[PDB]
From TrEMBL, chain B:
It comes from the Bacteria. This is Uncharacterized protein. It comes from Borreliella burgdorferi (strain ATCC 35210 / DSM 4680 / CIP 102532 / B31).
Length: 309, 37, 161, 313, 40
């Protein structure tokens, strides 16, 4: 194949220079499990067992024994396939654009295929990270002109049937009010017998700036970490800052029994076999990726939104 | 690396183009060698 | 002016809103089977980049010059300044991309018209529009030139007001 | 490659049947040197030296010696890539259009790829020869609708800063007046220190026919051509003078030295026609192919080309 | 048409046309009759 497909050879040789997605920091190693599906839906069945009565004491002769029942639940997850197109120079034409210490037309903004693919993959990975964190797809800073997505395609911030807290616009600068809302949400959190697990908190830069203020020689961050340790059996509590969030606070456990990410094994950018060619030196290539696959149990994510208006 | 040599076998289109250019240059050289004003 | 436009002492500083560049790729959504033609343009009369152009057959070659919607041949999507060559998408083909406008305050969904300078303006100026142009985004200023995302699909049957 | 690309195989098989360009006769072998470029510009630097003072006599002990300076000039040349398209028959479809005497569709003007490529290459070579000689690209006999070219792209006929002479309309048949203008131009020629070199003259067929008349009462044993050759030898240090006839010229006489130090041709190594890899295909029997060629690369020192134009109107 | 300058992207390119001429040569038969003496 590499004897015939120069583009495949270049992708193989430069695939290692693409940095790892930052979304890996928001999940434990066990929480992520790949699936084999490009586009469509997949039904996951979860089995459980329960006790019908008290156990039976084995003494002398007896035939009537207590029973153990079973139950099942079916969850459907939707996966979507998306594509991008980019222009690049042609392999037989790169020799006429190999300048000193660089290749490509500065005037025409044309690059060799390897560099073009690397940059496009980086941008697509950024988009995928934004979707996983927020659940929306947009390319504007205002978050408008969103691409409409299918049902059963949720992110951490917009997952339904979770704890949602709202801080009024009049209390947007009152860390005491924000922490009161956080405590109420933590009280409403329901982890059951899986409480002994590390917890993850994601905050916006403004909330990060507010957290390091003195508590009203203790910090709001320290108080929050202690409060979360009170509920998670004093496991680890990780704090992360993301520029993809705005006046939002996300708190959720890192337990694979409560929240699981089942992405398609084609989620990350992959080249397409089709390459547009003509008589000129410019060619076009396509990159494919897949979105969807976040599954969570009910009332295990706390989402605090601080209204600005 | 010229089309004149029948033993030459191109491997790809870039080699074919280089062979075409070399053939043109060799033909010009031969024309100048055989020219008598 | 030009598209590339220079040595810098320092480099210029998320993925969102990085397409707001004068030399950005004109087609927001491209497609194979789109017809692209080459023409000459006047190197001292008007710079046709990202403007509606018309065919002017001169005594030496057919040039493209910025023109109005009434006599528009297509949209100039790219220019090669080294050869002073303009690349034109004919009006018979659809377009969805960024074009030069003169009004810094245009909202989304508004009807638009190309003026004599090959510039997007509001269709309420009075001239009867003959092309279907709609604003897909608010106009943004690059500091100064105003650009806007538009969708152009063919001619309009009866000229509007 | 030949086991996969029939078009490439056929081009390799039939490339030898295209005749050499006629422009090779207008230059000496040393005057032509290929360059590796397709489109863009290329710079050439020429270095010169000069004496600052009289030489220093070396006697006894001396520390101060006369110096020799240096200077340079830079010349920029432009190259342009051009392409043509042509339709032909698909390789697998030739058997259904084979005939007892030929192959192809006469009623629809469809040829096999090899013949179509040969004809297109011949036409493009004619166009390239015309551009090299005249400095302009056009497909009309009137010479209008010229393709606009890049700066620093000239031919032998439109090279700036040369000697230009114009024979008036009323003297369009007076060979004596034509020779008067030619002598004035040859006097105005400035060859510097490279004057001892062969010279080349190119004339239109009408001028060539006028040049074989007996010299003028008419004289015997001497022709106007002989008189012109003697006049040119008066300035080229009695070196060789060559005369050529070209139908591309029209009422023009072009005189220039065949010395690489004065006039040089640095064409792109891809100037002559070259097939393109892309071949348009569909479900029918008709396919399309493309041919590329590069123009540009004539460099000449100033005031070393004499151009005499005989006016008709 | 004039050749196309290959810079940036373009798919609309000047073409080279071909033509076929059919040359025909006609041959005609003609006859004379003359009188003579059988085997003045």
């Amino acid at each position: 194949l590499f004897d015939e497909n120069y583009y495949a050879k270049a992708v193989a040789n430069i695939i290692g220079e693409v940095k790892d997605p930052i979304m890996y920091k928001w999940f434990s190693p066990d929480q992520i499990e790949d699936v084999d599906l490009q586009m469509g839906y997949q039904k996951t069945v979860k089995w459980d067992a329960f006790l019908n009565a008290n156990p039976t004491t084995i003494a002398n002769e007896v035939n009537t024994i207590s029973t153990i029942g079973f139950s099942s639940e079916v969850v459907r997850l939707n996966y979507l396939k998306l594509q991008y197109k980019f222009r690049h120079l042609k392999q037989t034409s790169e020799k006429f654009y190999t300048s000193d210490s660089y290749i490509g037309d500065i005037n025409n903004n044309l690059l060799p295929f390897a560099q073009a693919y690397k940059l496009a993959s980086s941008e697509i990975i950024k988009l995928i990270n934004h979707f996983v964190l927020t659940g929306t797809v947009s390319i504007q800073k205002d978050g408008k002109n969103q691409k409409r997505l299918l049902p059963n395609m949720y992110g951490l911030l917009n997952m339904p049937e979770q704890i949602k807290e709202e801080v009024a616009s009049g209390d947007k600068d009152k860390m005491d009010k924000i922490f009161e809302k956080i405590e109420a949400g933590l009280s409403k959190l329901e982890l059951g017998d899986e409480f002994s697990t590390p917890m993850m908190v994601i905050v916006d830069p403004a909330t990060s700036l507010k957290l390091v203020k003195p508590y009203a020689c203790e910090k709001w961050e320290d108080v929050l970490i202690q409060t979360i340790k009170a509920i998670n059996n004093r496991e680890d509590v990780y704090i992360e800052t993301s520029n993809l969030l705005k006046h939002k606070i996300l708190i959720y456990p890192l337990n694979s029994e409560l929240i699981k990410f089942k992405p398609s094994k084609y989620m990350l950018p992959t080249p397409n076999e089709q390459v547009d060619k003509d008589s000129t030196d410019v060619a076009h290539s396509y990159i494919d990726f897949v979105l969807g696959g976040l599954l969570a149990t009910r009332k295990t994510i706390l989402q605090v939104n601080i209204k600005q208006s | 690396a010229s089309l004149l040599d029948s033993n030459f076998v191109p491997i790809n289109f870039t080699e074919f183009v280089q062979a075409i250019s070399n053939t043109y240059k060799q033909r010009r050289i031969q024309f100048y060698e055989n020219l008598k004003r | 002016y030009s598209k590339s436009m220079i040595e810098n002492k320092v480099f210029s500083s998320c993925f969102k809103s990085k397409n707001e560049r004068v030399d950005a790729y004109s087609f927001a959504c491209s497609s194979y089977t789109d017809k692209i033609e080459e023409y000459l343009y006047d190197p001292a009369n008007s710079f046709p980049y990202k403007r509606g152009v018309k065919l002017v057959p001169k005594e030496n070659s057919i040039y493209v010059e910025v023109g109005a919607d009434t006599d528009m041949y297509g949209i100039c999507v790219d220019v090669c300044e080294f050869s002073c060559t303009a690349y034109v998408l004919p009006i018979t083909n659809n377009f969805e991309g960024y074009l030069v406008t003169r009004n810094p305050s245009i909202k989304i969904g508004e009807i638009l018209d190309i003026n004599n300078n090959g510039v997007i303006i509001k269709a309420g100026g009075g001239p009867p529009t003959a092309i279907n142009i709609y604003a897909l985004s608010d106009s943004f200023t690059i500091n100064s030139i105003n650009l806007i995302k538009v969708a152009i699909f063919g001619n309009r049957g009866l000229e509007k007001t």
